[PDB]
A paper describes a structure:
By combining biochemical methods and structural biology, we show that the C-terminal SH3 domain of PEX13 mediates intramolecular interactions with a proximal FxxxF motif. The SH3 domain also binds WxxxF peptide motifs in the import receptor PEX5, demonstrating evolutionary conservation of such interactions from yeast to human.
In this study, we present a high-resolution structure of the human PEX13 SH3 domain with an intramolecular FxxxF motif, demonstrating the structural basis of this non-canonical interaction with an SH3 domain. The domain boundaries defined by the NMR analysis were used to generate chimeric constructs which contain the PEX13 SH3 domain and the FxxxF motif (D371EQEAAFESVFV383) separated by GGGGS (GS) linkers. Backbone hydrogen-bonds are formed between A376 and G335 as well as S379, F381 and K336. Interestingly, nine out of the eleven Arg and Lys residues are located at the FxxxF binding surface, forming a positively charged surface area, which is favorable for binding negatively charged peptides such as the C-terminal FxxxF motif. The crystal structure was confirmed in solution by NMR titration experiments of the isolated SH3 domain with an FxxxF peptide (350-403). Strong chemical shift perturbations map to the binding site seen in the crystal structure, and spectral changes at saturated binding are very similar to the native SH3-CTR protein.
Residue numbers in the entry: 265 to 340, 371 to 382
Write the structure that this text describes.
Amino acid sequence: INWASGEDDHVVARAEYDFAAVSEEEISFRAGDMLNLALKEQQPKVRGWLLASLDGQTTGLIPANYVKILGKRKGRDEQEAAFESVFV
């Protein structure tokens, strides 16, 4: 999964809050953690969730409003905007 590793273009986000997964579909993270997100083109429609990776291999759902979207980064609506904007 090349967006997860950052081999492909991907979105980067910073967790605002701690989050413990309650199902296997979800991934845990801590406030301040950096995650890679699928591009909007690869995002599933699950109200209140986004597809992300903490570890660069494992993917799952995180609550959209538990992270700050920082922008699109090249592979080696305030939120809709941030998904198309460039990461510094």
